[PDB]
């Protein structure tokens, strides 16, 4: 009903991300700092040594089966339009290695999807029951890159003592991204027991295996106006279900009060 913010990203993404609310009187959420790339608040020493990068020797567009960066995930998983292949394992995704500054290829090679940033038109909107959400303003084919889960990089031990644990994403000795205080559009993406996007671990400018970057790709064709969401997983719901239950409203919902209650009747 009302456009309450023209661009929640304040110009930091490739495209603007408007916010609307046709449901209640809550203004545009502003209790976090919008950032488009991950930030640090303690010494992480991410390994940025350029000589540690595995890299290709391609002088084509990296579409051949000989691209090494492709072979580090068995093959390049992107097709000619930048979409994950039909055959991409959506249940247990592999690690993706994109081309980097050590590769001989050009910046517009075919193995550089995530590092090119958001292309789809998204909107932050007020939902009926799950607070803010994110939806599509266009159709989005299966396998399309949506956005990255961006936030503050922290250790496991620090994540264990964070008071607000609504925005913690484990990478994998594990590190986490906390999007509570610092994050992008992805912090608003809700859990759906019927998901349409999936998170994938990606390496771009560095290959420090402690610090994969989390990329969301559509797991099926998505229609204009549909809410985006992923399956947060049981490492979230085992803790969170004591405080609230899932409002996704699907018939397959596994984390509603009713679903949890029925399972306690395992007796």
């Amino acid at each position: 009903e009302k456009i309450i913010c023209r661009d929640v990203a304040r110009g930091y993404e490739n495209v603007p991300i408007p916010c609307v609310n046709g449901v209640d009187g809550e203004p545009c959420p502003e209790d976090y700092k919008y950032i488009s790339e991950n930030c640090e608040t303690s010494t992480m020493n991410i390994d940025r040594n350029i000589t540690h990068l595995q890299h290709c020797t391609c002088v084509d567009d990296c579409s051949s089966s000989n691209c090494l960066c492709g072979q580090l995930s068995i093959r390049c998983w992107y097709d000619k339009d930048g979409r994950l292949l039909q055959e991409f394992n959506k249940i247990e995704p592999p690690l993706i290695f994109e081309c980097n500054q050590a590769c001989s290829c050009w910046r517009n090679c075919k193995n550089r999807v995530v590092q090119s940033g958001i292309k789809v038109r998204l909107q932050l909107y007020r939902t009926a029951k799950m607070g803010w959400g994110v939806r599509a303003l266009q159709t989005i084919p299966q396998g399309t890159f949506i956005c990255e889960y961006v936030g503050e990089l922290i250790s496991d031990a620090e994540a264990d003592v964070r008071e607000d644990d609504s925005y913690l994403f484990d990478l994998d000795e594990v590190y986490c991204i906390d999007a509570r205080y610092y994050g992008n559009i992805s912090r608003f993406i809700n859990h759906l027991c019927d998901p349409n996007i999936i998170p994938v671990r990606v390496f771009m400018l560095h290959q420090d295996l402690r610090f994969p970057r989390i990329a969301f790709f559509s797991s099926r064709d998505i229609r204009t106006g549909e809410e985006l969401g992923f399956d947060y997983g049981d490492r979230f719901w085992d803790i969170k279900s004591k405080y609230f239950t899932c409002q996704c409203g699907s018939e397959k919902c596994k984390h509603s009060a009713e679903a949890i209650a029925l399972e306690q009747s395992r007796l």
Binding site: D160, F169, G233, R235, D238
Partner: peptide, 9 residues
């Protein structure tokens, strides 16, 4: 498990 809730792949 762990004290806090974690989204995961």
């Amino acid at each position: 498990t762990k004290q806090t809730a974690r989204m995961s792949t």
